[PDB]
A paper describes a structure:
PhaPAh native crystals diffracted to 3.0 Å, as observed using the Shanghai Synchrotron Research Facility (SSRF) BL17U beamline. After rounds of phase improvement and extension, model building, and refinement, the final structure was refined to a resolution of 3.00 Å with Rwork of 22.70% and Rfree of 29.50%. Size-exclusion chromatography and dynamic light scattering (DLS) analyses indicated that PhaPAh exists as a tetramer in solution and the final model in the asymmetric unit consists of four PhaPAh tetramers accordingly. The overall shape of the tetramer somewhat resembles a flat rectangular brick, with two short N-terminal helices from chains A and D protruding outwards from two opposite sides of the “brick”. The four monomers in the PhaPAh tetramer adopt two distinct conformations: type I, observed in chains A and D and type II, observed in chains B and C. When chains A and C are superimposed based on helix 2, a major conformational difference is found between types I and II, in which the position of the entire helix 3 shifts downwards in chain C. A very significant phenomenon, observed in both conformations, was the focused distribution of hydrophilic and hydrophobic residues on two opposite sides of the PhaPAh monomer. The formation of the tetramer can accordingly be rationalized the following way: chains A and D expose their respective hydrophobic surfaces to each other, while loop regions of these two chains are next to each other forming a shape resembling chopsticks. The still exposed hydrophobic regions of the stacked A–D dimer then recruit chains B and C through hydrophobic interactions to form the tetramer. The recruitment of chains B and C leaves no hydrophobic region exposed to the solvent environment in the tetramer.
Numbering used by the authors:
A (entry chain C): 17 to 50, 60 to 115
B (entry chain A): 3 to 109
C (entry chain D): 3 to 110
D (entry chain B): 9 to 51, 62 to 106
Write the structure that this text describes.
Amino acid sequence: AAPLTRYNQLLASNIEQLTRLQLASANAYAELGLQDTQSLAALGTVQLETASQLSRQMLDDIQKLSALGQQFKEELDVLTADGIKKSTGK
Amino acid sequence: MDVIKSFTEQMQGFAAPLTRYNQLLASNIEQLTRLQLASANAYAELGLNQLQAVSKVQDTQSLAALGTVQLETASQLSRQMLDDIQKLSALGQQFKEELDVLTADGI
Amino acid sequence: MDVIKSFTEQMQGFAAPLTRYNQLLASNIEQLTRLQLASANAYAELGLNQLQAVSKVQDTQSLAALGTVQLETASQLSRQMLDDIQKLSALGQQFKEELDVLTADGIK
Amino acid sequence: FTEQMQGFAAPLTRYNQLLASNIEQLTRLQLASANAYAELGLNTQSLAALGTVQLETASQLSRQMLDDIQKLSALGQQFKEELDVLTA
């Protein structure tokens, strides 16, 4: 469990969102591919601005993830220090 | 005749910025995938080497060797976890950057 | 005005099949991603449980936890790997399938 | 017995690699298509041909994907035969 899972989840999460973005883009090209240069400049602007927002959120989730990861490394350092004490055992 | 038309479309400059955008997306998808593959391979190598390790401790009695395996696997786990988070943060930064260049040049 | 135009495009049927192809690809990328995440979480869980088990040791009589978690971890990892291969084969099989209906319908 | 653990590492990576293989390639497909349309945006039999060629590309990637899944599953199944023998 723990931030390990949380991190793989954020990873896959971002992959998915980006794919849906590339799909939105591809569809938007095929349409119109079928007063229009106003809509072209608009399209480039809009897909830039959507990707931009997604990058904002990805970086926020990265920051929070780093926090939960702080909790976990606190938990792991106790496990490695128990390992050290036992390792001096025999 | 392919070359002239590709040059002139390259000169008009209409498909180039959009292709830049798609290209950028595909790249970040690729880099995220490779991060997930590396994480997965790391967790696998941990569980496997801990399994062989606990087996070689099975065929002895020293609780010290057991503790040394515990120490190694926990320490390397923290290692891998923090380095993975950092890799990801870098990926997110460089993506924000490339996007700001593309919006900037768009104007 | 959005509705009439999308109705007439869906009726012409020129942009629809290409969009179907793009949707096919996007869906398989999604499913492959989720399959990989599941695999990753599996290796993570099995590793971490065996770590907590090895941390619960001390007292040499604890070789029972050693053999039981080791046997459990090994056989369950067999399962995981084989079932993962099956999910992936299924995904590739079904991908083939939808491609063949799209080629078939594209011909006609 | 611990010897057998070597035989986990081959398919596991081979599995994980394969997954990511298929993801990359699919994304390139999604990319090529996504800018193929884009070229036609700057500009009707070219459309039919474009669809045919996308469907064919993806089909070939599919054959390859299914052959690699065959080889992998053979590795895993041989390895399971040996493991089910070793627990006996």
